[PDB]
Amino acid sequence: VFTTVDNINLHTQVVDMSMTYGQQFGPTYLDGADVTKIKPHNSHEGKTFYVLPNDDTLRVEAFEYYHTTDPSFLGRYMSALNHTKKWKYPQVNGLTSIKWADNNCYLATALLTLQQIELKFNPPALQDAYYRARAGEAANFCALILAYCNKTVGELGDVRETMSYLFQHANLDSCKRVLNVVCKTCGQQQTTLKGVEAVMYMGTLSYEQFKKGVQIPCTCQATKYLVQQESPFVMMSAPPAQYELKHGTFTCASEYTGNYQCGHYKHITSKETLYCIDGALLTKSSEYKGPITDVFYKENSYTTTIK
Numbered sequence: 324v325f326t327t328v329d330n331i332n333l334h335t336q337v338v339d340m341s342m343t344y345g346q347q348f349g350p351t352y353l354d355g356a357d358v359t360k361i362k363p364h365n366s367h368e369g370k371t372f373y374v375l376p377n378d379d380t381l382r383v384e385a386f387e388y389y390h391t392t393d394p395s396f397l398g399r400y401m402s403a404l405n406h407t408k409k410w411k412y413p414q415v416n417g418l419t420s421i422k423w424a425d426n427n428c429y430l431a432t433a434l435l436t437l438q439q440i441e442l443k444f445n446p447p448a449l450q451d452a453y454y455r456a457r458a459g460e461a462a463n464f465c466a467l468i469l470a471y472c473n474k475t476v477g478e479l480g481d482v483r484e485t486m487s488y489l490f491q492h493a494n495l496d497s498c499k500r501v502l503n504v505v506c507k508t509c510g511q512q513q514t515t516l517k518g519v520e521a522v523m524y525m526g527t528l529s530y531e532q533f534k535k536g537v538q539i540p541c542t543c544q545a546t547k548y549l550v551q552q553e554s555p556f557v558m559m560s561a562p563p564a565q566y567e568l569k570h571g572t573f574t575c576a577s578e579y580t581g582n583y584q585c586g587h588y589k590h591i592t593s594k595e596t597l598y599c600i601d602g603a604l605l606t607k608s609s610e611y612k613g614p615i616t617d618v619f620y621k622e623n624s625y626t627t628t629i630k
């Protein structure tokens with residue numbers, strides 16, 4: 324049979340039916356199923372298996388593909404995959420979504436959002452599954468998202484927190500945000516965020532209000548406005564509150580209805596008209612009013628007019 328850690332480079336192996344897979348190769352998986360406590364059967368022979376890194380060759384290959392050295396990672400990825408490959412991934416409005424199952428509402432919103440923002444993942448495993456998710460087979464991608472976020476199937480997820488962990492494994496080095504804070508006593512302070520901090524802001528949903536200026540506390544209340552922003556997109560987050568989404572003013576948004584952590588997530592996207600994707604369900608409207616917590620805007624470069 325074949326054992327591998329990345330499903331790219333296959334290592335050939337010969338097995339004995341008297342000793343279980345766990346005796347010969349350590350923890351072994353087969354399509355998410357755990358064959359560690361299962362003896363070798365005749366149905367599968369010469370097939371590819373997932374094994375934990377036990378030698379340095381596998382340890383290196385495991386980093387080249389996943390960019391992590393945590394031994395628990397492979398197990399968590401394999402256990403999430405066993406759920407995600409049973410999920411259904413319908414095509415809603417040309418985007419790949421997830422039919423509701425196991426509190427995946429936050430996963431569906433993130434998946435729909437990722438198909439609409441420009442993002443390059445550093446781990447080859449993330450990028451390869453990202454591509455195959457856009458094609459309609461997002462099982463391995465959703466499993467990887469869970470493993471990289473230290474979350475399990477069924478656990479409650481925050482879309483803003485999920486996007487953050489994904490952005491830290493994405494190439495956002497070219498992104499830059501220049502801010503200026505104006506306290507009357509203190510004066511003017513210029514800070515320059517880069518990477519994940521250049522893309523996300525918590526406090527307001529309106530990108531315009533961020534450009535105008537947000538009232539922030541200072542070491543002395545001051546005002547923080549956006550000076551220059553170079554990034555393929557920006558994420559504006561805020562606690563869930565009623566908001567009016569206008570057609571053409573944003574890319575996509577996260578609607579959150581319910582109590583803290585217990586609530587359910589919906590995805591609103593701005594196409595030729597406002598669409599609302601709740602798993603496999605699609606509703607159309609010209610205007611939208613509802614409780615929004617994240618809004619994704621498209622950007623390329625920007626420099627403020629006030630100096």
Ligand SMILES: Cc1ccc(OCCN(C)C)cc1C(=O)N[C@H](C)c1cc(-c2cnn(C)c2)cc(-c2cnn(C3CC3)c2)c1
Nearest residue numbers: 479480481484525561562563579581582583584585586616
């Ligand atoms: C689903 C889910 C899953 C997991 C989860 O984990 C949170 C804990 N993490 C550290 C692991 C949160 C959520 C969740 O409800 N998110 C929505 C978006 C949420 C809702 C509410 C809220 C308040 N009252 N009502 C009825 C609703 C408040 C905030 C919030 C306000 N301020 N902020 C941040 C600090 C600045 C976040 C966020």
Ligand SMILES: [Cl-]
Nearest residue numbers: 389390391445
């Ligand atoms: Cl890394």
Ligand SMILES: [Cl-]
Nearest residue numbers: 390445446492
């Ligand atoms: Cl990374």
Ligand SMILES: [Cl-]
Nearest residue numbers: 578580589613
């Ligand atoms: Cl609603």
Ligand SMILES: [Zn+2]
Nearest residue numbers: 332333334380
């Ligand atoms: Zn090899």
Ligand SMILES: [Zn+2]
Nearest residue numbers: 390445446492
């Ligand atoms: Zn990396």
Ligand SMILES: [Zn+2]
Nearest residue numbers: 406407425476
């Ligand atoms: Zn399940």
Ligand SMILES: [Zn+2]
Nearest residue numbers: 405406407409
């Ligand atoms: Zn399941």
Ligand SMILES: [Zn+2]
Nearest residue numbers: 506509541543
């Ligand atoms: Zn001050």
Ligand SMILES: [Zn+2]
Nearest residue numbers: 426428587588
């Ligand atoms: Zn839900």
